[PDB]
């Protein structure tokens, strides 16, 4: 589990997406798994304006942080998961490291803010929501 929050923005897996998310909904893209709702308090995350390819994720089924090295988001094929069937996940960006169904809304982070959430795993890769192309999560 986990979400971003940003301004008045809640940013989290659609998949875990709750009833109050789906009636405060932003945008939500099902080929990216994202969701976006609006909050009433105001979030102090700050989204990465940037093309880093190395940071660091929180890994809930280890309760570890892992620094990584992560691939340009990109269209890539996901197999079926206890959530979702084989399709191309889009925005999505791939590292070398442990991912289970519950590390999903784990945050990836460099020094300039969140890049992504967990939202993919298996075969000893973890798979992470690019939103750093969301420039209007940054406004209004
Ligand atoms: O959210 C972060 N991790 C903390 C770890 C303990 C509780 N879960 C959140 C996070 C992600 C990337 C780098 C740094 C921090
Ligand atoms: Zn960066």
Known sequence: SGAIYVGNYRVVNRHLATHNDW???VWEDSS??????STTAQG???IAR?????????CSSR????????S???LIFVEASE??????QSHLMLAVGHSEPGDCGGILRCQHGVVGI???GGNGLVGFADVRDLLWLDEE
Request: charged share 20%.
């Open 50 to 58: 940037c093309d880093c390819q190395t940071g660091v994720y929180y």
């Open 32 to 37: 990216r798994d994202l969701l976006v709702s």
């Open 83 to 88: 959530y979702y069937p084989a399709r191309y």
């Open 23 to 25: 009636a405060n909904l």
């Open 63 to 70: 309760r570890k942080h892992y620094p990584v090295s992560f």
């Open 72 to 74: 340009k988001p990109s």
């Open 44 to 46: 102090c995350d700050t």
């Open 118 to 120: 967990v939202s993919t």
